[PDB]
Amino acid sequence: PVVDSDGDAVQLNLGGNYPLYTIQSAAIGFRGGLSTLRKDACKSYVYEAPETDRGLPVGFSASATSQPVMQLGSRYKFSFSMPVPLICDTAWSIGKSETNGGISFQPITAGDYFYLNNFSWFEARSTEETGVYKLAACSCEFCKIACPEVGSFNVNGRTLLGIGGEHFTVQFQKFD
């Protein structure tokens, strides 16, 4: 199972009051939790908040029949737990490539008009050290494609996530 920063299995949202985690960068000196930068409409960039900035809470979900724990290599919908107007969801997805700050990339975004039902499927992949993971972004829940890794981009001083980029590793940290 994917473990959180305490060594406990990361729980999925299977109804009721769902379990929540911030996603912290596991890089040596400081991380800062993952959070949002407004892009447009109900849409935001997934970026790393400054140090000591709380990250946003994320819920992890999967299709019915799934066992209640996040499994290595498996695919999940990532959703921020954040106040939002009800026309908007908060699910993560692979964004259209764009140029921003002299950087061309496909960002990971979060949120869209609920009715478009847009989201991507994210995978925690193992690292040399336990409880520290690489994210991967998929366009399918169960299909046996090998997904592109998610990395970081320095865009106008802010660290944003996108497909490819610089090596980026995370921990899951419980929230509340």
Binding site: Y18, P83, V84, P85, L86, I87, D89
Partner: peptide
């Protein structure tokens, strides 16, 4: 999600518009 703009009616009077919330 999708309930936005909807009515919140209290004793036959429209006091609320579904607006926002966290989860």
């Amino acid at each position: 999600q999708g309930d936005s703009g909807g009515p919140v009616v209290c004793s036959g009077k429209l006091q609320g518009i579904v607006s926002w919330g966290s989860g």
